[PDB]
Symmetry: C2
């Protein structure tokens, strides 16, 4: 049940994928849609809201016209990295 804490935060279909893409740099909303396009505009937001609410992701709004929102991994969120990278390495090995 201490694994639960982590799984709430990072478990769940998408959280892992989203997170993975921010590892190598910040990302706008629409960059996520191009990547794993199966996700609905709604769902994407819910995840990013949750990740953000758990202090994993940092949402930054840029004072410009039009305004520009960019997402990126907080320092804390980075501590989930090793896990997430291992999730990736395993999914790759074990394809069928």
């Amino acid at each position: 049940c201490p694994v639960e804490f982590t799984l709430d935060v990072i478990g769940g279909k998408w959280k892992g994928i989203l997170f993975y893409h921010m590892i190598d740099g910040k990302k706008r909303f629409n960059e996520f849609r191009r990547i794993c396009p199966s996700i609905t505009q709604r769902m994407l937001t819910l995840q990013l809201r949750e990740l953000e609410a758990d202090g994993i992701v940092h949402r930054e709004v840029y004072h410009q016209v039009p305004p520009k929102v960019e997402y990126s991994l907080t320092e804390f969120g980075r501590t989930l990295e090793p896990i997430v990278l291992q999730m990736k390495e395993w999914g790759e090995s074990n394809r069928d």
Copy 2:
């Protein structure tokens, strides 16, 4: 989307917990309810059915009276272990709540 494969298999609220408890040995249904009791009889079954369907968990029926069903991690299911153990180590370090 290669993290997806893994997350289908092992992501989701419970799969990780359930799994964790089979690491150190097989378990009956009711042993799971006592552990993280928040799960409904129904949900527990769906997870175990799915884990089992994904070849992670092995369900074994014992020829006895009454009969006794015991769950355990297949050899394959063990390959997700490191991940799960790390999920644990992180949730322990980073205790907020």
